[PDB]
């Protein structure tokens, strides 16, 4: 329903999965990862999630496959694959 | 009146396809109309464009909801977009894909037809510009517009061989 | 509107292209530009023409606001330049104060308006609220139905505005997206024809060091009324001017845009639909369907909104059994669109007491389908037979959202 | 990584510069903040009703009124005794900041409101389809300053907004870039913490508008700094106190070549001469800022 405003709830864009925008998809090569954390910083779509072990993982629900993380990785620990 | 819906992603020039279709149809002596889905085009985002064909001037100003023909520029769109939505039973869906029609499995009564298009583009043009090449496939699949008129349009505004191959392959 | 007989002369281009082309061919001396969806293609096209050196005796200004867009044209017009811009929506709203100023300065500035809804909430789609909200500013307002009309409207409105008996600025209104972003067959404006149709702007008094004069003086209560009276008088003069220029255009170009108002199957209509702009196209198709089934439905298109063609409308509605007025706007607090309000007002003191009802629709670009038009016609048919149930209403509210 | 307060699901292009700039801003500012966001890509892409990407309070009024709206927020917090350590932050594009919103901003700075203002400078009006703003650099092609038979694109230099805001007596003015995330976060954080009107000008390469692949947004940003076309510095009370030195500066061609909006300088007759004018701008930067 339209509220008097109309005010929106915070973080409600989660309802919009943008993973369907991808032509290419990033894939972590965990063996090559230095855990520097650059990929989490550089993601425009907050689709790089931290882990307790200090590695990172993708939220493919939202990843738009722009390839910035892959481009900025100093370890070439991310590969872009078609899809 | 015939109605055409084109599916693509921001940056893939779906509006140009719609425009070229309306230009080519008019060269054939059919009254035409073309327009983007009204909004802001985001790179990578699913987008739509539209064309109408008629023997008489087109005065209708509503959106297109039930197309006779559908063109899908990017196969990956099938996962998130209902491209067969609203299509007439005697309609045709043209899809840019390596796979053959039946492999795609779309819940529709309309004829599903496929061309690689992307490969045709990389082979002949060099770049993966599929918005114009798929129009060749459209002409071959539907017979609604002469393929020569589509060539005429693309050369006028600015490829023709890539249009020609797609016309054969469909 | 478009003449099918002209098929061999037509080309398929974007509406914005046709309008930009028409502006160029109309030979402005100063173009000002501020971008806003969905007006952008017009000014982009003009800037490309400038970049290719296609417009002689002309300067183009990329300003920093719409306020400056119109304000530059005030300065330029007063020097003697033919002036042009295009705007919409938030842009037109920002100009509000300068709109009053320009009309009061009696400067024949022309702008295309690519009608779009107004904030809040922000919305980039078609609605007539932007221009309708300017109905007091003293600008001419004409509403085009198609691309042909929208482009042709540019030279026409220059000729009207610049006429010595008028000297009022004017808006050539066309539906945002619907007309601005569509590609359709159109006859592009002819240069040599326009050079003969549209005389060069030759103002009697300008800013000129060799003939110093003062423009924009301060009027006390002893003279202000007379300025306002003369603006009204200028609008009165624009009534026959709009008819004359439309007829003259028809004679020169072979394209008849119908002047102040335009009837479609109107003469014997039991139910008359009134509307402005591109919606008329959809209406014509629906009317044809009703006509095919022998139902006496017709359209009265209002082309000139300012000046308001009261006498013309009154005469045109004389045989109707019921009138339905469609507005792409609403005066919040009245539940009525401006055309509905003004139609009733012009009909009030006449002997004709037929029911007139209103629907507001196309708010924030909400599509007007053939089926919605059919629903509205059916409701009005009932009114013709049985009387008014609801005088004014939103045609298509979603009660689920409340 | 510091927490950001922007959610996934926004409609930014793949590799969006506006998304990055706002993300870094929030990381520096923290959650005790209220954001004022004039019309533009950032606003449109994050707030399609009924959805919002913002995890902090956020208000959008109009295109022109960022400065004034932020002023009213700050004043209301003071009046109602709710100011505390809340950061009132305006975030807007080059067009909103430098062009249509400059009166609003001038008034807010002059009055000395405790606000922070962040300019996201992608050197054109992007949401509307890439039109020239005063943020547009010399000889950039835009849809209202296209290359043509008699045009090399935008004929004007970039307006110097940091200098303009310094002249307003702003206690803290800093340039930054999405190419240097940590730098941006640090500068934003500092700007928010100073009591008074502070200004951050962030360079933000737009893949859609500049014409480069979405994967290169950060790379292009770094290249702007390395060619010395974008000086990175801080001004405290109108005096430059810090500058990011560039020992190994790159010729401007390397930056210009990577972008469709400059392609015309490589195809048109006299293009190399125009490139020289841009090189001269970079050389001036080196001299003036002490790079
Ligand atoms: C008064 C007014 N004029 C024009 C517009 C149209 N408009 C909305 S956003 C925008 C461009 C925004 O450019 P910028 O501020 O640089 O942000 P960007 O989209 O580049 O991030 C324009 C021209 C408007 N909304 N209001
Ligand atoms: S940027 Fe590369 S090395 Fe660093 S954490 Fe991410 S994947 Fe690992
Ligand atoms: S590809 Fe782009 S959107 Fe996806 S995780 Fe990497 S940076 Fe984020
Ligand atoms: S045009 Fe540029 S700023 Fe706008 S959404 Fe796309 S990448 Fe972001
Ligand atoms: Mg910008």
mmCIF file with all atom_site columns, N, CA and C in Angstrom, chain A residues 21 40-47 64 66 68, chain B residues 42, chain D residues 4-27 37 40-46 53-54 91 118 120-122 178 181 184-185 202-207 217-218:
data_model
loop_
_atom_site.group_PDB
_atom_site.id
_atom_site.type_symbol
_atom_site.label_atom_id
_atom_site.label_alt_id
_atom_site.label_comp_id
_atom_site.label_asym_id
_atom_site.label_entity_id
_atom_site.label_seq_id
_atom_site.pdbx_PDB_ins_code
_atom_site.Cartn_x
_atom_site.Cartn_y
_atom_site.Cartn_z
_atom_site.occupancy
_atom_site.B_iso_or_equiv
_atom_site.pdbx_formal_charge
_atom_site.auth_seq_id
_atom_site.auth_comp_id
_atom_site.auth_asym_id
_atom_site.auth_atom_id
_atom_site.pdbx_PDB_model_num
ATOM 1   N N  . UNK A 1 21  ? 21.312 -9.436 -14.527 1.00 0.00 ? 21  UNK A N  1
ATOM 2   C CA . UNK A 1 21  ? 21.902 -8.461 -15.434 1.00 0.00 ? 21  UNK A CA 1
ATOM 3   C C  . UNK A 1 21  ? 23.165 -9.022 -16.089 1.00 0.00 ? 21  UNK A C  1
ATOM 4   N N  . UNK A 1 40  ? 36.010 -6.650 -1.841  1.00 0.00 ? 40  UNK A N  1
ATOM 5   C CA . UNK A 1 40  ? 34.842 -6.253 -1.066  1.00 0.00 ? 40  UNK A CA 1
ATOM 6   C C  . UNK A 1 40  ? 34.633 -4.741 -1.162  1.00 0.00 ? 40  UNK A C  1
ATOM 7   N N  . UNK A 1 41  ? 35.746 -3.999 -1.144  1.00 0.00 ? 41  UNK A N  1
ATOM 8   C CA . UNK A 1 41  ? 35.749 -2.545 -1.185  1.00 0.00 ? 41  UNK A CA 1
ATOM 9   C C  . UNK A 1 41  ? 35.187 -2.057 -2.520  1.00 0.00 ? 41  UNK A C  1
ATOM 10  N N  . UNK A 1 42  ? 35.609 -2.692 -3.621  1.00 0.00 ? 42  UNK A N  1
ATOM 11  C CA . UNK A 1 42  ? 35.442 -2.118 -4.948  1.00 0.00 ? 42  UNK A CA 1
ATOM 12  C C  . UNK A 1 42  ? 34.110 -2.528 -5.580  1.00 0.00 ? 42  UNK A C  1
ATOM 13  N N  . UNK A 1 43  ? 33.333 -3.389 -4.911  1.00 0.00 ? 43  UNK A N  1
ATOM 14  C CA . UNK A 1 43  ? 32.092 -3.865 -5.509  1.00 0.00 ? 43  UNK A CA 1
ATOM 15  C C  . UNK A 1 43  ? 31.023 -2.776 -5.444  1.00 0.00 ? 43  UNK A C  1
ATOM 16  N N  . UNK A 1 44  ? 30.502 -2.293 -6.599  1.00 0.00 ? 44  UNK A N  1
ATOM 17  C CA . UNK A 1 44  ? 29.452 -1.267 -6.612  1.00 0.00 ? 44  UNK A CA 1
ATOM 18  C C  . UNK A 1 44  ? 28.122 -1.776 -6.063  1.00 0.00 ? 44  UNK A C  1
ATOM 19  N N  . UNK A 1 45  ? 27.996 -3.104 -5.969  1.00 0.00 ? 45  UNK A N  1
ATOM 20  C CA . UNK A 1 45  ? 26.704 -3.724 -5.739  1.00 0.00 ? 45  UNK A CA 1
ATOM 21  C C  . UNK A 1 45  ? 26.676 -4.494 -4.422  1.00 0.00 ? 45  UNK A C  1
ATOM 22  N N  . UNK A 1 46  ? 27.693 -4.277 -3.577  1.00 0.00 ? 46  UNK A N  1
ATOM 23  C CA . UNK A 1 46  ? 27.772 -4.876 -2.251  1.00 0.00 ? 46  UNK A CA 1
ATOM 24  C C  . UNK A 1 46  ? 27.471 -6.374 -2.322  1.00 0.00 ? 46  UNK A C  1
ATOM 25  N N  . UNK A 1 47  ? 28.042 -7.042 -3.332  1.00 0.00 ? 47  UNK A N  1
ATOM 26  C CA . UNK A 1 47  ? 27.779 -8.446 -3.601  1.00 0.00 ? 47  UNK A CA 1
ATOM 27  C C  . UNK A 1 47  ? 28.972 -9.318 -3.209  1.00 0.00 ? 47  UNK A C  1
ATOM 28  N N  . UNK A 1 64  ? 26.282 -8.036 -10.711 1.00 0.00 ? 64  UNK A N  1
ATOM 29  C CA . UNK A 1 64  ? 25.928 -7.576 -12.048 1.00 0.00 ? 64  UNK A CA 1
ATOM 30  C C  . UNK A 1 64  ? 27.018 -7.946 -13.056 1.00 0.00 ? 64  UNK A C  1
ATOM 31  N N  . UNK A 1 66  ? 30.188 -6.904 -13.489 1.00 0.00 ? 66  UNK A N  1
ATOM 32  C CA . UNK A 1 66  ? 30.870 -5.762 -14.080 1.00 0.00 ? 66  UNK A CA 1
ATOM 33  C C  . UNK A 1 66  ? 32.354 -6.070 -14.261 1.00 0.00 ? 66  UNK A C  1
ATOM 34  N N  . UNK A 1 68  ? 34.822 -5.487 -11.981 1.00 0.00 ? 68  UNK A N  1
ATOM 35  C CA . UNK A 1 68  ? 35.720 -4.568 -11.286 1.00 0.00 ? 68  UNK A CA 1
ATOM 36  C C  . UNK A 1 68  ? 36.590 -5.333 -10.286 1.00 0.00 ? 68  UNK A C  1
ATOM 37  N N  . UNK B 2 42  ? 19.878 1.471  -18.226 1.00 0.00 ? 42  UNK B N  1
ATOM 38  C CA . UNK B 2 42  ? 21.039 1.124  -17.421 1.00 0.00 ? 42  UNK B CA 1
ATOM 39  C C  . UNK B 2 42  ? 21.799 -0.010 -18.104 1.00 0.00 ? 42  UNK B C  1
ATOM 40  N N  . UNK D 3 4   ? 29.389 -0.378 5.075   1.00 0.00 ? 4   UNK D N  1
ATOM 41  C CA . UNK D 3 4   ? 28.683 0.602  4.265   1.00 0.00 ? 4   UNK D CA 1
ATOM 42  C C  . UNK D 3 4   ? 27.190 0.502  4.578   1.00 0.00 ? 4   UNK D C  1
ATOM 43  N N  . UNK D 3 5   ? 26.422 1.507  4.142   1.00 0.00 ? 5   UNK D N  1
ATOM 44  C CA . UNK D 3 5   ? 25.017 1.604  4.508   1.00 0.00 ? 5   UNK D CA 1
ATOM 45  C C  . UNK D 3 5   ? 24.161 1.733  3.253   1.00 0.00 ? 5   UNK D C  1
ATOM 46  N N  . UNK D 3 6   ? 24.684 1.189  2.149   1.00 0.00 ? 6   UNK D N  1
ATOM 47  C CA . UNK D 3 6   ? 23.957 1.056  0.897   1.00 0.00 ? 6   UNK D CA 1
ATOM 48  C C  . UNK D 3 6   ? 23.745 -0.433 0.627   1.00 0.00 ? 6   UNK D C  1
ATOM 49  N N  . UNK D 3 7   ? 22.537 -0.788 0.175   1.00 0.00 ? 7   UNK D N  1
ATOM 50  C CA . UNK D 3 7   ? 22.173 -2.176 -0.043  1.00 0.00 ? 7   UNK D CA 1
ATOM 51  C C  . UNK D 3 7   ? 22.335 -2.546 -1.513  1.00 0.00 ? 7   UNK D C  1
ATOM 52  N N  . UNK D 3 8   ? 22.544 -3.849 -1.818  1.00 0.00 ? 8   UNK D N  1
ATOM 53  C CA . UNK D 3 8   ? 22.383 -4.364 -3.179  1.00 0.00 ? 8   UNK D CA 1
ATOM 54  C C  . UNK D 3 8   ? 20.957 -4.153 -3.687  1.00 0.00 ? 8   UNK D C  1
ATOM 55  N N  . UNK D 3 9   ? 20.786 -4.261 -5.009  1.00 0.00 ? 9   UNK D N  1
ATOM 56  C CA . UNK D 3 9   ? 19.465 -4.250 -5.619  1.00 0.00 ? 9   UNK D CA 1
ATOM 57  C C  . UNK D 3 9   ? 19.136 -2.916 -6.287  1.00 0.00 ? 9   UNK D C  1
ATOM 58  N N  . UNK D 3 10  ? 20.022 -1.927 -6.112  1.00 0.00 ? 10  UNK D N  1
ATOM 59  C CA . UNK D 3 10  ? 19.885 -0.648 -6.792  1.00 0.00 ? 10  UNK D CA 1
ATOM 60  C C  . UNK D 3 10  ? 20.098 -0.859 -8.290  1.00 0.00 ? 10  UNK D C  1
ATOM 61  N N  . UNK D 3 11  ? 19.702 0.143  -9.084  1.00 0.00 ? 11  UNK D N  1
ATOM 62  C CA . UNK D 3 11  ? 19.626 0.002  -10.530 1.00 0.00 ? 11  UNK D CA 1
ATOM 63  C C  . UNK D 3 11  ? 20.806 0.680  -11.224 1.00 0.00 ? 11  UNK D C  1
ATOM 64  N N  . UNK D 3 12  ? 21.936 0.829  -10.524 1.00 0.00 ? 12  UNK D N  1
ATOM 65  C CA . UNK D 3 12  ? 23.118 1.408  -11.145 1.00 0.00 ? 12  UNK D CA 1
ATOM 66  C C  . UNK D 3 12  ? 23.620 0.532  -12.292 1.00 0.00 ? 12  UNK D C  1
ATOM 67  N N  . UNK D 3 13  ? 24.191 1.151  -13.336 1.00 0.00 ? 13  UNK D N  1
ATOM 68  C CA . UNK D 3 13  ? 24.796 0.358  -14.398 1.00 0.00 ? 13  UNK D CA 1
ATOM 69  C C  . UNK D 3 13  ? 25.842 -0.571 -13.787 1.00 0.00 ? 13  UNK D C  1
ATOM 70  N N  . UNK D 3 14  ? 26.183 -1.644 -14.514 1.00 0.00 ? 14  UNK D N  1
ATOM 71  C CA . UNK D 3 14  ? 27.330 -2.457 -14.152 1.00 0.00 ? 14  UNK D CA 1
ATOM 72  C C  . UNK D 3 14  ? 28.545 -1.543 -14.026 1.00 0.00 ? 14  UNK D C  1
ATOM 73  N N  . UNK D 3 15  ? 29.166 -1.551 -12.842 1.00 0.00 ? 15  UNK D N  1
ATOM 74  C CA . UNK D 3 15  ? 30.388 -0.806 -12.577 1.00 0.00 ? 15  UNK D CA 1
ATOM 75  C C  . UNK D 3 15  ? 30.138 0.667  -12.249 1.00 0.00 ? 15  UNK D C  1
ATOM 76  N N  . UNK D 3 16  ? 28.982 0.966  -11.640 1.00 0.00 ? 16  UNK D N  1
ATOM 77  C CA . UNK D 3 16  ? 28.521 2.339  -11.449 1.00 0.00 ? 16  UNK D CA 1
ATOM 78  C C  . UNK D 3 16  ? 29.417 3.134  -10.493 1.00 0.00 ? 16  UNK D C  1
ATOM 79  N N  . UNK D 3 17  ? 29.853 4.310  -10.966 1.00 0.00 ? 17  UNK D N  1
ATOM 80  C CA . UNK D 3 17  ? 30.688 5.254  -10.233 1.00 0.00 ? 17  UNK D CA 1
ATOM 81  C C  . UNK D 3 17  ? 29.913 5.936  -9.103  1.00 0.00 ? 17  UNK D C  1
ATOM 82  N N  . UNK D 3 18  ? 28.618 6.196  -9.330  1.00 0.00 ? 18  UNK D N  1
ATOM 83  C CA . UNK D 3 18  ? 27.779 6.835  -8.326  1.00 0.00 ? 18  UNK D CA 1
ATOM 84  C C  . UNK D 3 18  ? 27.565 5.888  -7.145  1.00 0.00 ? 18  UNK D C  1
ATOM 85  N N  . UNK D 3 19  ? 27.372 4.594  -7.444  1.00 0.00 ? 19  UNK D N  1
ATOM 86  C CA . UNK D 3 19  ? 27.258 3.563  -6.423  1.00 0.00 ? 19  UNK D CA 1
ATOM 87  C C  . UNK D 3 19  ? 28.519 3.521  -5.560  1.00 0.00 ? 19  UNK D C  1
ATOM 88  N N  . UNK D 3 20  ? 29.697 3.527  -6.204  1.00 0.00 ? 20  UNK D N  1
ATOM 89  C CA . UNK D 3 20  ? 30.975 3.490  -5.500  1.00 0.00 ? 20  UNK D CA 1
ATOM 90  C C  . UNK D 3 20  ? 31.154 4.714  -4.598  1.00 0.00 ? 20  UNK D C  1
ATOM 91  N N  . UNK D 3 21  ? 30.894 5.910  -5.146  1.00 0.00 ? 21  UNK D N  1
ATOM 92  C CA . UNK D 3 21  ? 31.099 7.154  -4.419  1.00 0.00 ? 21  UNK D CA 1
ATOM 93  C C  . UNK D 3 21  ? 30.239 7.198  -3.159  1.00 0.00 ? 21  UNK D C  1
ATOM 94  N N  . UNK D 3 22  ? 28.958 6.832  -3.298  1.00 0.00 ? 22  UNK D N  1
ATOM 95  C CA . UNK D 3 22  ? 28.035 6.849  -2.176  1.00 0.00 ? 22  UNK D CA 1
ATOM 96  C C  . UNK D 3 22  ? 28.417 5.781  -1.152  1.00 0.00 ? 22  UNK D C  1
ATOM 97  N N  . UNK D 3 23  ? 28.825 4.605  -1.649  1.00 0.00 ? 23  UNK D N  1
ATOM 98  C CA . UNK D 3 23  ? 29.294 3.513  -0.810  1.00 0.00 ? 23  UNK D CA 1
ATOM 99  C C  . UNK D 3 23  ? 30.452 3.971  0.082   1.00 0.00 ? 23  UNK D C  1
ATOM 100 N N  . UNK D 3 24  ? 31.451 4.637  -0.514  1.00 0.00 ? 24  UNK D N  1
ATOM 101 C CA . UNK D 3 24  ? 32.641 5.054  0.217   1.00 0.00 ? 24  UNK D CA 1
ATOM 102 C C  . UNK D 3 24  ? 32.287 6.173  1.195   1.00 0.00 ? 24  UNK D C  1
ATOM 103 N N  . UNK D 3 25  ? 31.428 7.095  0.749   1.00 0.00 ? 25  UNK D N  1
ATOM 104 C CA . UNK D 3 25  ? 30.944 8.178  1.588   1.00 0.00 ? 25  UNK D CA 1
ATOM 105 C C  . UNK D 3 25  ? 30.363 7.621  2.889   1.00 0.00 ? 25  UNK D C  1
ATOM 106 N N  . UNK D 3 26  ? 29.492 6.612  2.766   1.00 0.00 ? 26  UNK D N  1
ATOM 107 C CA . UNK D 3 26  ? 28.805 6.033  3.915   1.00 0.00 ? 26  UNK D CA 1
ATOM 108 C C  . UNK D 3 26  ? 29.793 5.311  4.835   1.00 0.00 ? 26  UNK D C  1
ATOM 109 N N  . UNK D 3 27  ? 30.817 4.685  4.243   1.00 0.00 ? 27  UNK D N  1
ATOM 110 C CA . UNK D 3 27  ? 31.834 3.975  5.008   1.00 0.00 ? 27  UNK D CA 1
ATOM 111 C C  . UNK D 3 27  ? 32.600 4.953  5.896   1.00 0.00 ? 27  UNK D C  1
ATOM 112 N N  . UNK D 3 37  ? 19.870 14.057 -0.838  1.00 0.00 ? 37  UNK D N  1
ATOM 113 C CA . UNK D 3 37  ? 20.335 13.543 -2.120  1.00 0.00 ? 37  UNK D CA 1
ATOM 114 C C  . UNK D 3 37  ? 19.526 14.155 -3.264  1.00 0.00 ? 37  UNK D C  1
ATOM 115 N N  . UNK D 3 40  ? 19.285 12.820 -9.610  1.00 0.00 ? 40  UNK D N  1
ATOM 116 C CA . UNK D 3 40  ? 20.401 12.346 -10.413 1.00 0.00 ? 40  UNK D CA 1
ATOM 117 C C  . UNK D 3 40  ? 20.400 10.823 -10.436 1.00 0.00 ? 40  UNK D C  1
ATOM 118 N N  . UNK D 3 41  ? 21.423 10.236 -11.068 1.00 0.00 ? 41  UNK D N  1
ATOM 119 C CA . UNK D 3 41  ? 21.521 8.791  -11.184 1.00 0.00 ? 41  UNK D CA 1
ATOM 120 C C  . UNK D 3 41  ? 21.451 8.144  -9.806  1.00 0.00 ? 41  UNK D C  1
ATOM 121 N N  . UNK D 3 42  ? 22.221 8.682  -8.851  1.00 0.00 ? 42  UNK D N  1
ATOM 122 C CA . UNK D 3 42  ? 22.306 8.110  -7.516  1.00 0.00 ? 42  UNK D CA 1
ATOM 123 C C  . UNK D 3 42  ? 20.911 8.013  -6.902  1.00 0.00 ? 42  UNK D C  1
ATOM 124 N N  . UNK D 3 43  ? 20.175 9.131  -6.928  1.00 0.00 ? 43  UNK D N  1
ATOM 125 C CA . UNK D 3 43  ? 18.843 9.204  -6.344  1.00 0.00 ? 43  UNK D CA 1
ATOM 126 C C  . UNK D 3 43  ? 17.896 8.229  -7.045  1.00 0.00 ? 43  UNK D C  1
ATOM 127 N N  . UNK D 3 44  ? 17.839 8.297  -8.386  1.00 0.00 ? 44  UNK D N  1
ATOM 128 C CA . UNK D 3 44  ? 16.886 7.513  -9.165  1.00 0.00 ? 44  UNK D CA 1
ATOM 129 C C  . UNK D 3 44  ? 17.150 6.019  -8.964  1.00 0.00 ? 44  UNK D C  1
ATOM 130 N N  . UNK D 3 45  ? 18.427 5.628  -8.976  1.00 0.00 ? 45  UNK D N  1
ATOM 131 C CA . UNK D 3 45  ? 18.777 4.218  -9.051  1.00 0.00 ? 45  UNK D CA 1
ATOM 132 C C  . UNK D 3 45  ? 18.577 3.527  -7.701  1.00 0.00 ? 45  UNK D C  1
ATOM 133 N N  . UNK D 3 46  ? 18.569 4.309  -6.609  1.00 0.00 ? 46  UNK D N  1
ATOM 134 C CA . UNK D 3 46  ? 18.533 3.760  -5.262  1.00 0.00 ? 46  UNK D CA 1
ATOM 135 C C  . UNK D 3 46  ? 17.127 3.794  -4.662  1.00 0.00 ? 46  UNK D C  1
ATOM 136 N N  . UNK D 3 53  ? 17.657 1.652  -1.287  1.00 0.00 ? 53  UNK D N  1
ATOM 137 C CA . UNK D 3 53  ? 18.936 1.006  -1.023  1.00 0.00 ? 53  UNK D CA 1
ATOM 138 C C  . UNK D 3 53  ? 19.602 1.572  0.231   1.00 0.00 ? 53  UNK D C  1
ATOM 139 N N  . UNK D 3 54  ? 19.063 2.679  0.759   1.00 0.00 ? 54  UNK D N  1
ATOM 140 C CA . UNK D 3 54  ? 19.695 3.393  1.859   1.00 0.00 ? 54  UNK D CA 1
ATOM 141 C C  . UNK D 3 54  ? 19.326 2.759  3.196   1.00 0.00 ? 54  UNK D C  1
ATOM 142 N N  . UNK D 3 91  ? 24.679 14.785 -0.693  1.00 0.00 ? 91  UNK D N  1
ATOM 143 C CA . UNK D 3 91  ? 25.405 14.066 -1.726  1.00 0.00 ? 91  UNK D CA 1
ATOM 144 C C  . UNK D 3 91  ? 24.711 14.338 -3.058  1.00 0.00 ? 91  UNK D C  1
ATOM 145 N N  . UNK D 3 118 ? 29.063 16.350 -0.401  1.00 0.00 ? 118 UNK D N  1
ATOM 146 C CA . UNK D 3 118 ? 29.898 15.492 -1.226  1.00 0.00 ? 118 UNK D CA 1
ATOM 147 C C  . UNK D 3 118 ? 29.440 15.607 -2.680  1.00 0.00 ? 118 UNK D C  1
ATOM 148 N N  . UNK D 3 120 ? 29.687 14.201 -6.349  1.00 0.00 ? 120 UNK D N  1
ATOM 149 C CA . UNK D 3 120 ? 30.050 13.035 -7.139  1.00 0.00 ? 120 UNK D CA 1
ATOM 150 C C  . UNK D 3 120 ? 30.204 13.488 -8.590  1.00 0.00 ? 120 UNK D C  1
ATOM 151 N N  . UNK D 3 121 ? 31.455 13.735 -9.001  1.00 0.00 ? 121 UNK D N  1
ATOM 152 C CA . UNK D 3 121 ? 31.722 14.415 -10.261 1.00 0.00 ? 121 UNK D CA 1
ATOM 153 C C  . UNK D 3 121 ? 32.049 13.397 -11.352 1.00 0.00 ? 121 UNK D C  1
ATOM 154 N N  . UNK D 3 122 ? 31.043 13.090 -12.182 1.00 0.00 ? 122 UNK D N  1
ATOM 155 C CA . UNK D 3 122 ? 31.225 12.230 -13.341 1.00 0.00 ? 122 UNK D CA 1
ATOM 156 C C  . UNK D 3 122 ? 31.247 13.049 -14.635 1.00 0.00 ? 122 UNK D C  1
ATOM 157 N N  . UNK D 3 178 ? 37.117 7.959  -6.528  1.00 0.00 ? 178 UNK D N  1
ATOM 158 C CA . UNK D 3 178 ? 36.679 6.601  -6.243  1.00 0.00 ? 178 UNK D CA 1
ATOM 159 C C  . UNK D 3 178 ? 37.803 5.621  -6.585  1.00 0.00 ? 178 UNK D C  1
ATOM 160 N N  . UNK D 3 181 ? 39.731 4.468  -2.734  1.00 0.00 ? 181 UNK D N  1
ATOM 161 C CA . UNK D 3 181 ? 38.647 4.328  -1.756  1.00 0.00 ? 181 UNK D CA 1
ATOM 162 C C  . UNK D 3 181 ? 38.974 4.761  -0.328  1.00 0.00 ? 181 UNK D C  1
ATOM 163 N N  . UNK D 3 184 ? 39.197 8.457  0.048   1.00 0.00 ? 184 UNK D N  1
ATOM 164 C CA . UNK D 3 184 ? 37.884 9.081  0.018   1.00 0.00 ? 184 UNK D CA 1
ATOM 165 C C  . UNK D 3 184 ? 37.192 8.927  1.371   1.00 0.00 ? 184 UNK D C  1
ATOM 166 N N  . UNK D 3 185 ? 37.211 7.707  1.926   1.00 0.00 ? 185 UNK D N  1
ATOM 167 C CA . UNK D 3 185 ? 36.585 7.438  3.213   1.00 0.00 ? 185 UNK D CA 1
ATOM 168 C C  . UNK D 3 185 ? 37.177 8.354  4.285   1.00 0.00 ? 185 UNK D C  1
ATOM 169 N N  . UNK D 3 202 ? 34.572 14.482 -5.296  1.00 0.00 ? 202 UNK D N  1
ATOM 170 C CA . UNK D 3 202 ? 35.053 13.157 -5.658  1.00 0.00 ? 202 UNK D CA 1
ATOM 171 C C  . UNK D 3 202 ? 34.940 12.924 -7.163  1.00 0.00 ? 202 UNK D C  1
ATOM 172 N N  . UNK D 3 203 ? 36.088 12.646 -7.793  1.00 0.00 ? 203 UNK D N  1
ATOM 173 C CA . UNK D 3 203 ? 36.151 12.278 -9.200  1.00 0.00 ? 203 UNK D CA 1
ATOM 174 C C  . UNK D 3 203 ? 35.559 10.875 -9.361  1.00 0.00 ? 203 UNK D C  1
ATOM 175 N N  . UNK D 3 204 ? 34.662 10.707 -10.345 1.00 0.00 ? 204 UNK D N  1
ATOM 176 C CA . UNK D 3 204 ? 33.912 9.467  -10.463 1.00 0.00 ? 204 UNK D CA 1
ATOM 177 C C  . UNK D 3 204 ? 33.702 9.106  -11.932 1.00 0.00 ? 204 UNK D C  1
ATOM 178 N N  . UNK D 3 205 ? 34.640 8.366  -12.565 1.00 0.00 ? 205 UNK D N  1
ATOM 179 C CA . UNK D 3 205 ? 34.491 7.962  -13.967 1.00 0.00 ? 205 UNK D CA 1
ATOM 180 C C  . UNK D 3 205 ? 33.249 7.118  -14.230 1.00 0.00 ? 205 UNK D C  1
ATOM 181 N N  . UNK D 3 206 ? 32.466 7.537  -15.228 1.00 0.00 ? 206 UNK D N  1
ATOM 182 C CA . UNK D 3 206 ? 31.221 6.860  -15.553 1.00 0.00 ? 206 UNK D CA 1
ATOM 183 C C  . UNK D 3 206 ? 31.440 6.015  -16.800 1.00 0.00 ? 206 UNK D C  1
ATOM 184 N N  . UNK D 3 207 ? 31.339 4.670  -16.705 1.00 0.00 ? 207 UNK D N  1
ATOM 185 C CA . UNK D 3 207 ? 31.565 3.804  -17.863 1.00 0.00 ? 207 UNK D CA 1
ATOM 186 C C  . UNK D 3 207 ? 30.562 4.070  -18.985 1.00 0.00 ? 207 UNK D C  1
ATOM 187 N N  . UNK D 3 217 ? 36.230 1.092  -14.100 1.00 0.00 ? 217 UNK D N  1
ATOM 188 C CA . UNK D 3 217 ? 35.840 2.302  -13.389 1.00 0.00 ? 217 UNK D CA 1
ATOM 189 C C  . UNK D 3 217 ? 36.962 2.786  -12.467 1.00 0.00 ? 217 UNK D C  1
ATOM 190 N N  . UNK D 3 218 ? 37.501 1.877  -11.647 1.00 0.00 ? 218 UNK D N  1
ATOM 191 C CA . UNK D 3 218 ? 38.558 2.207  -10.700 1.00 0.00 ? 218 UNK D CA 1
ATOM 192 C C  . UNK D 3 218 ? 39.842 2.546  -11.461 1.00 0.00 ? 218 UNK D C  1
#
